[PDB]
Design a protein around this ligand. Structure first.
Ligand SMILES: *[C@@H]1O[C@H](CO)[C@@H](O)[C@H](O)[C@H]1NC(C)=O
Lengths: 211, 192, 213, 218, 221
């Protein structure tokens, strides 16, 4: 088996810049390399074959180079939709193998999150479980700190977070943190607050409600 | 009156496997020993007969098939095998009685190349079939009118023989000896 | 024009069998290499099997003896039979047109194969009501298995401002998900907002209306 | 002509792993396919499998397909037969043979490798006399070699001088897991008062050497 | 999985006479392209590896004496040894190599046939040295007899014993073509000293009536 190593694992650039991705081979494969692009929730698309020939329908800003053990993919003049995971595949020997990929996100101006809090439904509350939801809408960069505080007591271990992939026109992220509790534990406190720390906020933003 | 096995094995140049060469050997005494205890070869696989009785058996005809392939594909030159070479370039019958002799040819056929193999074919080849078509391969229902394009590919492909490659990618020269016995007088025999 | 559309993904118990189909358009499947390439959740691409133009078949070591690739020329379809599935085989399987056992120039949309002993469970849909500029509302789709869940807003008429989050696997062994929308706070009394949730593994279709409390 | 040589005798406990060797020498080992033959004590030949050392092509008997493994190293011209967990079932002699191709007879044969798989452990024999009966023309005497493991033992008479009339019986496997043996000799009964008959028993596995004198009872 | 069954399992031929061994194939092993049956005959002498005698069902291997011949085709094959000699005593196997997996015959044992020779019977009581160990071994010896088939029965105080005896047979002697046999009766020392008469009774073709060799425990001259 021949391993393909891609570098870097992830790369972040602004639109209009150049992206250079490297694929290195366990043994030499002699221009028998292909490049694929995979956007979230979609299938891979053939970008480059023969390490240097461009597939049909692919814009000229994609270019392939290299041979032997060293290969390079260059995407010029980045467009907010050119952002996806890029895979190198070798067809020198059997079995054919892929690299883990290089994820390429887009760089944009810092955007503060908008914070909303949702108390548990009455309908779910009749069931025995309360779910408190905190939403951070349209922020950048991805790094954000979300803290659940119940009557100003910091909660731990009963929350789960989910982040969207980059919105493909305005390049923001959004995040959901859900705090799940029994109805007995839920009706044992009064104030439920969600505190958000992010680079785009001068000080943390707290959104709270009373039961 | 020895049979000209040297012209086959010690030939200056070898054919590509899609257009494999065949030399017919008849009315001669074959001394296989000058061929068989050379240790030069890397693979010496025989099927249905052993070389240790070849110098001393008799056959109507003998066939020497010459070509060049890769290491990964020398295993396909055998009965009951599958793969690009066995299916589209050179196929041996399941009842094959003969020998496949292959040796590394990196010194001679690898340059810092000209050999090709058939990549596309709608149906596998029958045993001992030779296809030298350069007709454009039609992968769709639209005819291709003889130029490469969408759903129409060139059926042949070049080997990338470079000396720095791994042992599997190096060119190997292969000779297949087939022993033809029929209801006819035998014309190839050994010193016996 | 080339089209590849897949069929047959679903939940199956370990040791069970499943058959994936890939209908093909725009080329004759009997004269082309074709392959099945799987992708584990959150992982890379793994080539699984290939069928040659001449009918020869080849498989990867992880699936040999269990997987069988086949083709129907009278239905222009590619088939993958699996027979003895393990949980490590859980992945999205992609149908791909193969250029001579070299590279994959056209791909299908993929179908998801989940191998788990867990039972199918339908989701429960709850409202996330708007607060007392811009306001946010949404729907919480909780306690379902397996994936996927498809959510719309107003039967596809509302697409601007919507964020449906990836599912998170609770410690229950079930999935939960939220989809939210950003709308003018003028609108809440006037406009009616309904989320359409569809979980086909459970045959569940819920149209849940959310409004301020 | 080509020549095969195999590894030495093996004695193992059940559950152990084992790998036996067969090395080829000669003119044209290049085209020789190496097969493996099992022969259990007192039974016929069973074909286990075949390998081509040049590229490692291997074929197995359905009876042996999944629980032995046949390997080869072309650099030393050696074929290998391997078990990962031995059973008492596997006690046999294993022959490596060679033929100049597939569907060819096996011209060349190795000397064989004896494999004994037993729960027993090494024990020296105990040697007892089978004294001549109290009738002195022809007389029969002998040695009883009991309770030893593993095979083999060598029995001689008069330090190798006595051979005519000597019958050393094949060893028998007792239900104890140990072996027993007897060696007898017929001699004139003129001799009995004159000549002293000593039997020498050698068991190399336990480094046991025993000389026993055989005389009529008193 | 072509099966081969040879007949007979055993064969007794006199020096200079003819030995015939048939081998029947489950399926045909004729290679129609080369017009040769892919059948082989091997000889295995006691304690030695098999030797290839004949290949292609009728072609003798180099060095094999002319008295060996191979015959047959389709499913029926025969190995013929004309003028059998004492060095030809072995087990003969037919093997098919038309297809993998290769398969063997069950084996054919060939012994020399000679005039009937009665065994000479001797009985050995257990040594005093062995009795100190706790187990007694009584030995019965049948020396230089033919044919191989012989019946040996142990009687302790005229009571027939069962389950406590083991037999051992030599290979055929290469000069007089006789056999010899050992029957070992193993007992506890208590059971050994609960009886007086120990007898070994031999039935063989060369004896007009059964021969009994007995001793009394603790008896002397
Ligand atoms: C082929 O060339 C080799 C190497 O020079 C030589 O040893 C051999 O005799 C030649 N064969 C013939 C038939 O001339």
């Amino acid at each position: 088996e021949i391993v393909l190593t891609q570098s870097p694992g992830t790369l972040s650039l602004s639109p209009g810049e150049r992206a250079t991705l490297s694929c290195r081979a366990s043994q030499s494969v002699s221009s028998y390399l292909a490049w694929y692009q995979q956007k979230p929730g979609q299938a891979p698309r053939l970008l480059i074959y023969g390490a240097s020939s461009r597939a049909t329908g692919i814009p000229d800003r994609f270019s392939g180079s290299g041979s032997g053990t060293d290969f390079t993919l260059t995407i010029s003049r980045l467009e907010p939709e050119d952002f996806a995971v890029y895979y190198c595949q070798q067809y020198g020997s059997s079995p054919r193998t892929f690299g883990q990929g290089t994820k390429l996100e887009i760089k944009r101006t810092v955007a503060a999150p908008s914070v909303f809090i949702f108390p548990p439904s009455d309908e779910q509350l009749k069931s025995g479980t309360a779910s408190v939801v905190c939403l951070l809408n349209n922020f950048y960069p991805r790094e954000a700190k979300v803290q659940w505080k119940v009557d100003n007591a910091l909660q731990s271990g009963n929350s789960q977070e989910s982040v969207t992939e980059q919105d493909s026109k305005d390049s923001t992220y959004s995040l959901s943190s859900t705090l799940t509790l029994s109805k007995a534990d839920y009706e044992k406190h009064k104030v439920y607050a969600c505190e958000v720390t992010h680079q785009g906020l001068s000080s943390p933003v707290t959104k709270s409600f009373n039961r | 009156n020895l049979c000209p096995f040297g012209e086959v094995f010690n030939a200056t140049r070898f054919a590509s496997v899609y257009a494999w060469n065949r030399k017919r050997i008849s009315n001669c005494v074959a001394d296989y020993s000058v061929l068989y205890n050379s240790a030069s070869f890397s693979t010496f696989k025989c099927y249905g007969v052993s070389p240790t009785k070849l110098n001393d058996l008799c056959f109507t005809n003998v066939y020497a098939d010459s070509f060049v392939i890769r290491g990964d594909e020398v295993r396909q030159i055998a009965p009951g095998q599958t793969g690009k070479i066995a299916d589209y370039n050179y196929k041996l019958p399941d009842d094959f009685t003969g020998c496949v002799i292959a040796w590394n040819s990196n010194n001679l056929d690898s340059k810092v190349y000209n050999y090709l193999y058939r990549l596309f074919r709608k149906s596998n080849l029958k045993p001992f079939e030779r296809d030298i078509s350069t007709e454009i391969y039609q992968a769709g229902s639209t005819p291709c009118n003889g130029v490469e394009g969408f759903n129409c590919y060139f059926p042949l492909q070049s080997y990338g023989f470079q000396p720095t490659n791994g042992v599997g990618y190096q060119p190997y020269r292969v000779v297949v000896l087939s022993f033809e016995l029929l209801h006819a007088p035998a014309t190839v025999c050994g010193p016996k | 024009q080339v089209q590849l559309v897949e069929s047959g993904g679903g939940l199956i118990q370990p040791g069970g069998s499943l058959r994936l189909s890939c209908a093909a358009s725009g080329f004759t499947v009997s004269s082309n290499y074709m392959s099945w390439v799987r992708q584990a959740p959150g992982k890379g691409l793994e080539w699984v099997s290939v069928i040659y133009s001449g009918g020869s078949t080849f498989y990867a070591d992880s699936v040999k003896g269990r997987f069988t690739i086949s083709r129907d020329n009278s239905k222009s379809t590619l088939y993958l039979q699996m027979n003895s599935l393990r949980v490590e085989d859980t992945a999205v399987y992609y149908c791909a047109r193969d250029f001579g056992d070299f590279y994959f120039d056209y791909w299908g949309q993929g179908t998801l194969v989940t191998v788990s002993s867990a039972s199918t469970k339908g989701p429960s849909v709850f409202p996330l009501a708007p607060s007392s500029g811009t306001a946010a509302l949404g729907c919480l789709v909780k306690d379902y298995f397996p994936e996927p869940v498809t959510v719309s807003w107003n039967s596809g008429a509302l697409t601007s401002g919507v964020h449906t989050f990836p599912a998170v696997l609770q410690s229950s062994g079930l999935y939960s998900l939220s989809s939210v929308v950003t709308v003018p706070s003028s609108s809440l009394g006037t406009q009616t907002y309904i989320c359409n949730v569809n979980h086909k593994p459970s045959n569940t279709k819920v149209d849940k209306k959310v409004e301020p409390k």
